[PDB]
Write a protein that binds this ligand. Structure first.
Ligand SMILES: [Ca+2]
Length: 222
């Protein structure tokens, strides 16, 4: 997260860290057994770390759970980073408490101009912002017109742009797979962008509201 602020600890209780000996991507707890992330973050096995604030300090709030299953969207395309969404089944259910709470799936697609929250432990590009401490950022959803104007012909139905065309504030590498929360629902998944916080290159996010049938179907009947 570039140009952000340190989240109030545990204010994003759904936020998880994907760990393979080190933090490499974010994700969102959706219920006790499943985590939503980005398909481009795929690894056959990962450790999910819940209840984190400072990922390099033991706080007493953490839960470290290994994955039992990692499911990439069936139409994920790495060429164009289309359908950049994945499901992670926890080997054991998470414990819901004051530190760990699921985030709701969206019951509608949020329109352009909606202010959202993005968070993560990715690069901050700043000497005073510690990427070790969960970072928060307020970002508005951009129109499809602005999004495609910025990345001509690269924006599919499965994506939406959010951020600032002026640059300066953005999600970045290491934030990938993390949440975009709007009005208390999970609207997006950190997915891609050209650089981080560069003028004219806003962040691109997987559009969660078009995947609700696949998500619930996968979580329920398997
Ligand atoms: Ca910690």
């Amino acid at each position: 997260i570039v140009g952000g602020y340190e989240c109030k600890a545990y204010s994003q209780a759904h936020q998880v860290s994907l760990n393979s000996g080190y933090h490499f991507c974010g994700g969102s707890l959706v219920n006790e057994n499943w985590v939503v992330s980005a398909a481009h973050c795929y690894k056959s096995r990962v450790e999910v770390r819940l209840g984190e604030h400072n990922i390099k300090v033991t706080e007493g709030s953490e839960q470290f759970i290994s994955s039992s299953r990692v499911i990439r969207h069936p139409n994920y395309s790495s060429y164009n980073i289309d359908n950049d969404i994945m499901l992670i089944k926890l080997s054991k259910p998470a414990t819901l408490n004051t530190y760990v709470q699921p985030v709701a799936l969206p019951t509608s697609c949020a329109p352009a101009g909606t202010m959202c929250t993005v968070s993560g432990w990715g690069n901050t590009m700043s000497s005073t912002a510690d990427s070790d401490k969960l970072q928060c950022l307020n970002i508005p959803i951009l129109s499809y017109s602005d999004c495609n104007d910025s990345y001509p012909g690269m924006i599919t139905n499965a994506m939406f742009c959010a951020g600032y065309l002026e640059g300066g504030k953005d999600s970045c590498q290491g934030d990938s797979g993390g949440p975009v929360v709007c009005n208390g629902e999970l609207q997006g998944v950190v997915s891609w962008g050209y650089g981080c916080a560069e003028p004219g290159n806003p962040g691109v996010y997987a559009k969660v509201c078009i995947f609700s049938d696949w998500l619930t179907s996968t979580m329920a009947s398997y």
